[PDB]
Structures are given as C-alpha cells and as structure tokens.
Short mmCIF file of C-alpha atoms in Angstrom, two decimals:
data_model
loop_
_atom_site.label_atom_id
_atom_site.label_comp_id
_atom_site.label_asym_id
_atom_site.label_seq_id
_atom_site.Cartn_x
_atom_site.Cartn_y
_atom_site.Cartn_z
CA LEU A 25 45.55 12.35 55.03
CA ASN A 26 43.80 9.08 55.95
CA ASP A 27 40.53 10.76 57.01
CA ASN A 28 38.93 9.61 53.74
CA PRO A 29 39.70 6.15 52.30
CA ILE A 30 39.13 7.55 48.80
CA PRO A 31 42.03 9.75 47.61
CA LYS A 32 41.79 13.50 48.05
CA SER A 33 42.69 13.87 44.35
CA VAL A 34 41.65 11.67 41.43
CA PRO A 35 42.23 11.84 37.65
CA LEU A 36 39.37 12.00 35.13
CA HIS A 37 37.92 8.98 33.31
CA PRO A 38 36.39 8.96 29.81
CA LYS A 39 33.25 7.38 31.28
CA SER A 40 33.17 10.28 33.74
CA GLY A 41 34.24 12.66 30.98
CA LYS A 42 31.04 11.80 29.11
CA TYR A 43 28.88 13.12 31.95
CA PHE A 44 31.32 16.00 32.50
CA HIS A 45 30.69 17.11 28.92
CA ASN A 46 26.97 16.49 29.56
CA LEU A 47 27.13 19.36 32.07
CA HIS A 48 25.16 22.43 31.01
CA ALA A 49 24.10 25.74 32.53
CA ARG A 50 20.46 26.72 32.85
CA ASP A 51 18.91 28.73 30.01
CA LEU A 52 19.07 32.07 31.80
CA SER A 53 19.35 34.03 28.54
CA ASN A 54 15.79 33.48 27.31
CA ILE A 55 14.11 34.10 30.67
CA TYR A 56 16.26 37.19 31.21
CA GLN A 57 15.47 38.65 27.79
CA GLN A 58 11.75 37.94 28.21
CA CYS A 59 11.64 39.55 31.65
CA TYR A 60 13.54 42.51 30.18
CA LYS A 61 10.94 42.75 27.41
CA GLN A 62 8.05 42.55 29.87
CA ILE A 63 9.72 45.23 32.00
CA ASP A 64 10.13 47.61 29.07
CA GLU A 65 6.58 47.00 27.82
CA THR A 66 5.16 47.63 31.29
CA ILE A 67 7.25 50.82 31.42
CA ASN A 68 5.67 51.80 28.10
CA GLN A 69 2.14 51.12 29.36
CA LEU A 70 3.01 53.15 32.47
CA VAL A 71 4.20 56.18 30.51
CA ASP A 72 1.12 55.76 28.30
CA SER A 73 -1.32 55.68 31.24
CA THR A 74 0.12 58.84 32.81
CA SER A 75 -1.87 62.08 33.05
CA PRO A 76 -0.88 65.73 33.62
CA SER A 77 -3.34 65.98 36.52
CA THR A 78 -1.23 63.46 38.46
CA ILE A 79 1.30 65.36 40.59
CA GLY A 80 4.34 63.62 42.02
CA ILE A 81 5.88 61.99 38.95
CA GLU A 82 9.48 62.73 39.99
CA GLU A 83 9.48 60.17 42.80
CA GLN A 84 7.82 57.53 40.62
CA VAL A 85 10.24 57.96 37.72
CA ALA A 86 13.08 57.90 40.27
CA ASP A 87 11.97 54.59 41.78
CA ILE A 88 11.22 52.96 38.42
CA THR A 89 14.62 53.99 37.05
CA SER A 90 16.25 52.71 40.24
CA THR A 91 14.48 49.38 39.73
CA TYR A 92 15.58 49.42 36.08
CA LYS A 93 19.24 50.04 36.88
CA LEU A 94 19.09 47.42 39.65
CA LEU A 95 17.71 44.76 37.30
CA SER A 96 20.24 45.76 34.63
CA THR A 97 23.11 45.38 37.11
CA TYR A 98 21.69 42.03 38.23
CA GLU A 99 21.42 40.77 34.64
CA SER A 100 24.94 41.94 33.80
CA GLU A 101 26.43 40.33 36.91
CA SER A 102 24.56 37.10 36.15
CA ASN A 103 25.97 37.16 32.61
CA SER A 104 29.46 37.68 34.05
CA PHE A 105 28.80 34.86 36.52
CA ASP A 106 27.85 32.34 33.84
CA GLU A 107 30.79 33.46 31.69
CA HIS A 108 33.13 32.90 34.63
CA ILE A 109 31.50 29.50 35.21
CA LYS A 110 32.16 28.59 31.58
CA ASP A 111 35.78 29.72 31.93
CA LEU A 112 36.11 27.67 35.12
CA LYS A 113 34.72 24.55 33.45
CA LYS A 114 37.12 25.09 30.54
CA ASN A 115 39.97 25.32 33.05
CA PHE A 116 38.74 22.10 34.68
CA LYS A 117 38.60 20.29 31.34
CA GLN A 118 42.07 21.48 30.31
CA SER A 119 43.49 20.47 33.70
CA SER A 120 41.86 17.03 33.47
CA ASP A 121 43.13 16.61 29.90
CA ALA A 122 46.63 16.20 31.40
CA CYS A 123 45.51 13.89 34.21
CA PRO A 124 47.46 10.65 34.81
CA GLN A 125 46.13 7.12 34.30
CA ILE A 126 44.14 5.03 36.80
CA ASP A 127 45.85 2.22 38.71
CA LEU A 128 46.86 1.17 42.23
CA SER A 129 50.13 3.14 42.38
CA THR A 130 48.41 6.43 41.53
CA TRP A 131 45.65 5.67 44.05
CA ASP A 132 48.23 5.01 46.77
CA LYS A 133 50.20 8.15 45.90
CA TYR A 134 47.05 10.28 46.02
CA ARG A 135 45.92 8.63 49.28
CA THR A 136 49.22 9.25 51.08
CA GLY A 137 49.04 12.86 49.90
CA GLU A 138 50.01 14.20 46.47
CA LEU A 139 48.77 17.63 45.35
CA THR A 140 48.77 16.78 41.65
CA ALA A 141 45.12 16.82 40.50
CA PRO A 142 43.40 20.03 41.71
CA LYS A 143 39.67 19.50 42.20
CA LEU A 144 36.97 21.98 41.22
CA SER A 145 36.02 22.38 44.90
CA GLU A 146 38.84 24.73 45.89
CA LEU A 147 38.62 26.56 42.56
CA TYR A 148 34.88 27.16 43.04
CA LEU A 149 34.71 28.08 46.74
CA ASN A 150 37.19 30.94 46.27
CA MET A 151 36.38 31.69 42.63
CA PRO A 152 37.28 35.29 41.68
CA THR A 153 34.28 37.52 41.08
CA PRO A 154 34.21 38.99 37.55
CA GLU A 155 33.30 42.54 38.69
CA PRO A 156 31.88 43.64 35.32
CA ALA A 157 32.54 47.17 34.08
CA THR A 158 31.28 49.28 31.15
CA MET A 159 27.68 49.50 32.33
CA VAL A 160 25.18 48.72 29.57
CA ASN A 161 23.71 52.10 28.62
CA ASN A 162 23.24 51.65 24.84
CA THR A 163 19.93 49.80 25.30
CA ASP A 164 16.85 51.61 24.02
CA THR A 165 15.06 50.70 27.26
CA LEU A 166 17.64 52.78 29.14
CA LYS A 167 16.89 55.59 26.68
CA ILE A 168 13.16 55.29 27.44
CA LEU A 169 13.55 56.63 30.98
CA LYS A 170 14.15 60.27 32.01
CA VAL A 171 12.06 61.52 29.06
CA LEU A 172 9.02 61.92 31.34
CA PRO A 173 10.61 64.54 33.64
CA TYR A 174 11.08 68.07 32.28
CA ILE A 175 8.29 67.61 29.72
CA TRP A 176 5.29 69.30 31.40
CA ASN A 177 6.86 72.73 30.80
CA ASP A 178 7.58 72.62 27.05
CA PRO A 179 7.31 69.32 25.13
CA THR A 180 7.82 70.97 21.72
CA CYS A 181 11.36 72.14 22.62
CA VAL A 182 14.67 70.27 22.42
CA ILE A 183 17.98 71.70 23.64
CA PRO A 184 20.81 71.03 21.13
CA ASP A 185 23.07 69.41 23.76
CA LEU A 186 20.39 66.87 24.73
CA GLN A 187 22.32 64.09 22.98
CA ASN A 188 25.28 64.60 25.33
CA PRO A 189 25.88 61.30 27.20
CA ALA A 190 28.06 63.07 29.77
CA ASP A 191 25.26 63.03 32.35
CA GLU A 192 24.59 59.85 34.29
CA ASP A 193 20.80 59.96 33.74
CA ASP A 194 20.99 58.78 30.12
CA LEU A 195 20.94 62.33 28.69
CA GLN A 196 21.00 66.05 29.49
CA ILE A 197 17.34 67.01 29.11
CA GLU A 198 16.78 70.78 29.12
CA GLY A 199 14.69 73.42 27.42
CA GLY A 200 15.67 74.64 23.96
CA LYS A 201 14.17 75.45 20.57
CA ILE A 202 12.97 72.76 18.14
CA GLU A 203 10.16 72.24 15.64
CA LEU A 204 7.29 69.83 16.32
CA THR A 205 6.07 69.72 12.70
CA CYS A 206 7.67 68.21 9.61
CA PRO A 207 8.66 70.91 7.07
CA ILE A 208 8.07 68.52 4.15
CA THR A 209 4.46 67.80 5.15
CA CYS A 210 3.75 71.03 7.11
CA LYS A 211 1.76 68.94 9.61
CA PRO A 212 2.50 67.70 13.15
CA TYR A 213 3.88 64.22 12.53
CA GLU A 214 2.79 61.14 14.47
CA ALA A 215 5.47 58.77 13.07
CA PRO A 216 8.88 60.44 13.47
CA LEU A 217 12.25 59.23 12.23
CA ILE A 218 15.81 60.47 12.75
CA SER A 219 19.26 59.15 11.86
CA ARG A 220 22.49 59.46 13.81
CA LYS A 221 24.32 61.19 10.95
CA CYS A 222 21.66 63.74 9.96
CA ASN A 223 20.31 64.30 13.50
CA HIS A 224 17.07 65.65 12.02
CA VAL A 225 13.54 64.49 12.79
CA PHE A 226 11.09 63.98 9.92
CA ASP A 227 7.75 62.33 9.26
CA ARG A 228 7.85 58.77 7.94
CA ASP A 229 5.40 59.52 5.13
CA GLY A 230 7.24 62.74 4.29
CA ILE A 231 10.67 61.11 4.36
CA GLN A 232 9.45 58.24 2.17
CA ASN A 233 7.87 60.67 -0.30
CA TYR A 234 11.16 62.61 -0.39
CA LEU A 235 13.49 59.58 -0.53
CA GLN A 236 11.91 57.63 -3.39
CA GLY A 237 12.80 58.86 -6.86
CA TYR A 238 16.58 59.04 -6.32
CA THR A 239 18.99 56.33 -5.21
CA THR A 240 21.13 58.90 -3.36
CA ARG A 241 19.26 61.85 -1.83
CA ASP A 242 20.63 64.09 0.91
CA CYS A 243 18.64 65.36 3.87
CA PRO A 244 16.41 68.42 3.31
CA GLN A 245 18.03 70.23 6.24
CA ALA A 246 21.40 71.96 6.00
CA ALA A 247 24.69 71.42 7.90
CA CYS A 248 24.76 67.79 6.63
CA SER A 249 26.25 67.43 3.15
CA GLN A 250 26.54 63.64 3.46
CA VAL A 251 23.89 61.48 1.81
CA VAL A 252 21.46 59.52 4.00
CA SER A 253 20.09 56.14 2.93
CA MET A 254 17.30 53.96 4.31
CA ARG A 255 19.67 51.88 6.45
CA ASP A 256 21.11 55.04 8.04
CA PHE A 257 17.77 55.97 9.61
CA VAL A 258 17.02 54.42 13.01
CA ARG A 259 13.76 54.16 14.95
CA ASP A 260 14.09 56.46 17.96
CA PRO A 261 11.09 55.81 20.26
CA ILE A 262 11.80 58.92 22.36
CA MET A 263 10.48 61.21 19.62
CA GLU A 264 7.16 59.41 19.19
CA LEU A 265 6.96 59.12 22.99
CA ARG A 266 7.20 62.91 23.27
CA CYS A 267 4.68 63.48 20.47
CA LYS A 268 2.10 61.14 21.99
CA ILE A 269 2.70 62.64 25.45
CA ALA A 270 2.04 66.08 23.98
CA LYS A 271 -1.12 64.75 22.32
CA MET A 272 -2.25 63.28 25.65
CA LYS A 273 -1.57 66.61 27.37
CA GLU A 274 -3.59 68.43 24.70
CA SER A 275 -6.51 66.02 25.14
CA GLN A 276 -6.29 66.47 28.92
CA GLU A 277 -6.32 70.27 28.65
CA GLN A 278 -9.27 70.08 26.24
CA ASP A 279 -11.14 67.89 28.73
CA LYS A 280 -10.28 70.39 31.47
CA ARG A 281 -11.57 73.29 29.37
CA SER A 282 -14.80 71.40 28.64
CA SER A 283 -15.28 70.60 32.34
CA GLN A 284 -14.69 74.26 33.24
CA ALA A 285 -17.26 75.29 30.63
CA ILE A 286 -19.61 72.80 32.30
CA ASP A 287 -19.00 74.40 35.70
CA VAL A 288 -19.47 78.00 34.54
CA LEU A 289 -22.73 77.08 32.79
CA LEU B 17 40.99 -8.38 51.38
CA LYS B 18 41.54 -6.18 54.44
CA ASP B 19 41.61 -3.36 51.88
CA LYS B 20 38.61 -4.54 49.81
CA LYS B 21 36.31 -4.62 52.84
CA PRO B 22 36.67 -0.84 53.44
CA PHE B 23 36.35 -0.47 49.66
CA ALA B 24 32.90 -2.08 49.87
CA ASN B 25 32.05 0.16 52.83
CA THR B 26 33.09 3.20 50.79
CA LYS B 27 31.13 2.13 47.71
CA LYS B 28 28.06 1.74 49.93
CA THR B 29 28.48 5.16 51.53
CA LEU B 30 29.15 6.67 48.09
CA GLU B 31 26.00 5.23 46.53
CA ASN B 32 24.05 6.51 49.55
CA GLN B 33 25.62 9.94 49.03
CA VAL B 34 24.72 9.77 45.33
CA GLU B 35 21.07 8.98 46.09
CA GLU B 36 20.72 11.74 48.68
CA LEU B 37 22.41 14.30 46.43
CA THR B 38 20.11 13.28 43.57
CA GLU B 39 17.04 13.81 45.74
CA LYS B 40 18.42 17.17 46.87
CA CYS B 41 18.93 18.12 43.21
CA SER B 42 15.34 17.04 42.55
CA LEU B 43 14.24 19.36 45.36
CA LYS B 44 16.27 22.25 43.93
CA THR B 45 14.81 21.69 40.46
CA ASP B 46 11.35 21.67 42.05
CA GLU B 47 12.06 25.02 43.71
CA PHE B 48 13.40 26.33 40.39
CA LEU B 49 10.22 25.38 38.55
CA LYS B 50 8.22 26.88 41.43
CA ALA B 51 10.09 30.16 40.93
CA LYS B 52 9.39 29.93 37.19
CA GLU B 53 5.67 29.33 37.74
CA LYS B 54 5.42 32.21 40.22
CA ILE B 55 7.16 34.40 37.63
CA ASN B 56 4.52 33.35 35.11
CA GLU B 57 1.82 34.04 37.71
CA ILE B 58 3.00 37.58 38.40
CA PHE B 59 3.35 38.09 34.63
CA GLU B 60 -0.26 37.09 34.00
CA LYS B 61 -1.33 39.23 36.97
CA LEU B 62 0.39 42.23 35.37
CA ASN B 63 -1.32 41.38 32.08
CA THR B 64 -4.73 41.21 33.77
CA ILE B 65 -4.21 44.54 35.54
CA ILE C 2 -13.59 56.77 37.73
CA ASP C 3 -10.69 59.18 38.32
CA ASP C 4 -10.28 57.94 41.89
CA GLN C 5 -10.49 54.35 40.64
CA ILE C 6 -7.73 55.04 38.10
CA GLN C 7 -5.68 56.65 40.87
CA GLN C 8 -6.08 53.78 43.36
CA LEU C 9 -5.32 51.31 40.56
CA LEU C 10 -2.16 53.22 39.63
CA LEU C 11 -0.76 52.48 43.11
CA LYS C 12 -1.56 48.75 42.86
CA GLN C 13 0.24 48.15 39.56
CA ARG C 14 3.41 49.75 40.92
CA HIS C 15 3.03 47.59 44.04
CA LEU C 16 2.88 44.41 41.95
CA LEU C 17 5.79 45.71 39.85
CA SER C 18 7.88 46.14 43.00
CA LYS C 19 6.80 42.69 44.19
CA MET C 20 7.87 41.22 40.84
CA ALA C 21 11.21 43.03 41.05
CA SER C 22 11.79 41.69 44.56
CA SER C 23 10.94 38.16 43.41
CA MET C 24 13.08 38.92 40.35
CA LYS C 25 16.00 39.43 42.75
CA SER C 26 15.23 35.98 44.18
CA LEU C 27 15.69 34.53 40.68
CA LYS C 28 19.43 35.17 40.88
CA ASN C 29 19.47 33.61 44.35
CA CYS C 30 17.72 30.40 43.32
CA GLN C 31 19.73 30.05 40.11
CA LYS C 32 23.01 30.58 41.98
CA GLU C 33 22.00 28.02 44.61
CA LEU C 34 20.98 25.60 41.84
CA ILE C 35 24.16 25.92 39.76
CA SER C 36 26.02 25.57 43.06
CA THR C 37 25.63 22.69 45.53
CA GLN C 38 25.52 20.38 42.49
CA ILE C 39 28.96 20.61 40.84
CA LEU C 40 30.48 19.30 44.07
CA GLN C 41 28.05 16.38 43.98
CA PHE C 42 28.82 15.87 40.29
CA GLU C 43 32.51 15.59 41.15
CA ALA C 44 31.46 13.18 43.92
CA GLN C 45 29.62 10.95 41.44
CA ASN C 46 32.62 11.18 39.09
CA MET C 47 34.73 9.95 42.01
CA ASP C 48 32.15 7.18 42.45
CA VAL C 49 32.39 6.01 38.85
CA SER C 50 36.20 6.23 38.94
#
C-alpha cells in the first residue's frame, strides 16, 4: 500500500550482499565457557572450604545446584537461539539468492503490492523457538554436585548402583560397601583413577607401577576379563573429592579431640 | 520529476534513520561492554574473596 | 576466626547469587543487541538499494 514510498519488498543487491555477509553474531561461546569454568572452580573452592561443624548443607547444595541447572538451561537455550539465528540467516540468503533484478518495473510492482520477496522482519518477529531437549548431563561439572550430601555418615562406602543415571540428581548416592585403600599399594590413595570398562578405583602410582612392563595388562580385580589400556582410564574428580573430604573430616575430628583435651585439662 | 522529489525526501529520511539507528547501535554496544566490564568486576571480586 | 569464616561464607554465596542474577541479564542484553539491529540492517540495505 502507498503508506511508504519505498516498496514493501525489495530484492538483494551484491553491494548490499557484501554487508549482509559481513553480518556476524557476538562471540558468546568464549564468554559462556569462561563463565562456566569460573562457576565450576568456585564450586570446587566452596566444596573445599566446607567443614563438618557447619550444619545446614542440604539447603546450600540445593540452591547451588538450582543455580547450576538454571545457568545450564540458559546456556543451552542461548546456543539453540544462535543456531536458530544462523539457520534463519541461511534461509534469508537462500531466499535472496533467487531474488529478481533491480529496475523501475520491479519497483512499481512491489510498490503497488506484490508479495514476492519476504523480508526478514516477519520471519524474525514470529520466529519459532527451538525448545532444546536432551538436557546436558554428561558434563563433569554436573557430576561434581550431589556428592556433598550423604557423605557425613560414611565416606568410605559406595553402593554398587551409584552409577545408575536413572535418578534426576545426577546419580543414586546411597550407603554400600567399598574399599578406601588401593590393594596394590596397601595405602589410602590420594590420586585415584577409574575407567568406565573396569569400574575399579586404583592409585595412580600403583596403577602406573602395575601397567608398565606389559603392553597389554588386565585389571588386578576380577569380573573384568577385558584388557585396560592407558587411554581407557578417565580422570573422575568425584573420587578424589571424596578422599579429600574424608581427609578434611579426619583433620576436623582431630582438631575437635585436641580442643576437648584442652577443655578437660 | 514529480516522482524524484519524493525520492529525495525519502533518501533524506532514510539517511536520518540510518544515523539514528547507528547511534542506537553504538549505545547498545556501550551497554554490552558495560555488562562485560561488570562481569569482569564481579569475577575479580570473587577472586579477591 | 571461626565466626569470621562463618560470616564470610554467607558473603561469598551472596556475591555468587548476585553474579548469577547479573548472569541472567547477559542473555537479556545479548538478545536485545542481536535484535533491534537486523531490522535496521535491512533498512540500510534498502537504503543502498
């Protein structure tokens, strides 16, 4: 309609196509990964600064894991948003690739009303939301949480079904029966390692003293006849987290015993 | 000519629109860098604590 | 020193929550920056055409 002297639709020009290709989205990836890394390192320094004397850890782990899942959902929806923006700009470029030429007849036809060149305006105002699914739960930072609850009762125990991802809180943490020392070294290990195929925890020094000497050596434990190599082992921070939390609890109970000896004397 | 005169009017209003949208984009980039610097500020505050 | 550690444990979580709230504003400012500028880019493309 004649409300605007310029036509409501207009083809694309190579001079305009230059700037159109010059379009770029902001570098959200680097800032998002660095804020994710600062969030996980501050979570680590939180779980390191904890103490058994502090009561009321359930509410604090609940709110920090709520913040974590909120930021994860925000990052995933922002990723889906920029992906949809890229798809929309690809649709715009492929629709403008078939645009007509530029002359007076086309200008007149588009001024009198000709829905031939769809602009990005209508495609962006009512753009379909991506609605991302398959929530990201394979991140190690998501595995960091929930290990603090249910640890003040028995840290040296691990229930066999703890690796079940059926629960929504990243695991099914319960009490069981597990060893806190490495059978190869016969000493409580401070650097643990465990692979997904063997599912057995061992000391790094012990496992490297047992692995070298043979190019193919199976795990010392039973129920796993398959051979385990160096690339099969993965660094699970939950194990060392639990060991250092147990060490902190032992130091705290020793300090408590010394203070009680001070009081009684 | 009776068409070119409104064409000049439209080119004038379009260059005015371009200049005001460029200054609005400058303002939005300023607010973006302000958000970035406040992010850095809260990061260094967390580091200090 | 125990009470100081305790009262400092409630300040770090406060600044963490403040960062998370300002972190939520990051999506807002980036979505208002990527928007309100593609329309003006199409306007300047119309201007050059």
